[PDB]
Design a protein around this ligand. Sequence first.
Ligand SMILES: *[C@H]1O[C@H](CO)[C@@H](O[C@@H]2O[C@H](CO)[C@@H](O)[C@H](O)[C@H]2NC(C)=O)[C@H](O)[C@H]1NC(C)=O
Ligand SMILES: *[C@@H]1O[C@H](CO)[C@@H](O)[C@H](O)[C@H]1NC(C)=O
Ligand SMILES: *[C@H]1O[C@H](CO)[C@@H](O)[C@H](O)[C@H]1NC(C)=O
Length: 279
Amino acid sequence: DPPAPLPLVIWHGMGDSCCNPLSMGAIKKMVEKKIPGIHVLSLEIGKTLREDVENSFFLNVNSQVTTVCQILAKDPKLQQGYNAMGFSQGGQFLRAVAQRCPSPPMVNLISVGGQHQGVFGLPRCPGESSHICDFIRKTLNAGAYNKAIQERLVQAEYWHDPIREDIYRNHSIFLADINQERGVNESYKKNLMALKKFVMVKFLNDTIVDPVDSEWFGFYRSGQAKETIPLQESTLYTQDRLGLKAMDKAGQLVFLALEGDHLQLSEEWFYAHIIPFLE
Ligand SMILES: *[C@H]1O[C@H](CO)[C@@H](O[C@@H]2O[C@H](CO)[C@@H](O)[C@H](O)[C@H]2NC(C)=O)[C@H](O)[C@H]1NC(C)=O
Ligand SMILES: *[C@@H]1O[C@H](CO)[C@@H](O)[C@H](O)[C@H]1NC(C)=O
Ligand SMILES: *[C@H]1O[C@H](CO)[C@@H](O)[C@H](O)[C@H]1NC(C)=O
């Protein structure tokens, strides 16, 4: 019966699509396998595969989210609850859906390499021992926060500058809003705490996401870009603007990790640690 197999919603990452046999399509079948009868809906933003991939780079996130909530509302099989699983940026994107549209109701939220506190660095460009790599990130701030760029560039919408955090707070139209950086939005807090399980998967040897701690809702300590602090020690947790401390107390937060690079996981691992949250 319907209650036994809770429907699963999937949101792919940057540069990928809803229905590619080697990436999300393989996920869809690896789930329909271990769970007979499950209804899987892999989100597609736009009318074609081509628009879906380019949309992952060039369409205002807030606009994608409203589009998604519109789709989840017209699907009858979801009205009684649904699990969600986001890949890479798909992770923070699904958390926004949870915070902004309580109906239909999301149950378990699985984040696979998501960047809940954004990013501040370029792929394979460590700033510790490289001057050129470091200059770039600290300089694209004028660009990343430029009004016209903010609404046309997906990456810019979750770029988080720790050195000049006030500029980040006043100009980010996506990440800053869902992270309660400009005053606490009551419904966002109540809506997230309404989830049952929020599972965050972090790839220990990630070279693409800087800082990797963002995958566990952590980030660089304010004022600089070298040392990082975990979610627990951050102001977001301390003051509970999102309800994360309460949820953690209640056992609703799960922190998982594994060796490997970005989105590099085995069937072995996927069957042994993720499926349990979907069944
Ligand atoms: C690949 O990278 C991850 C993350 O750095 C490694 O996991 C641990 O990383 C910490 C931080 O450097 C080390 O202190 C530990 O020694 C690492 N774990 C282990 C195995 O002790 C992971 O080990 C690395 N895997 C590779 C490529 O060997
Ligand atoms: C808070 O979020 C809701 C949507 O969940 C939105 O309608 C509202 O305008 C936002 N601002 C506040 C704090 O009211
Ligand atoms: C952004 O807005 C805040 C609101 O208090 C203002 O005080 C501050 O000067 C602005 N910060 C920057 C650098 O844009």
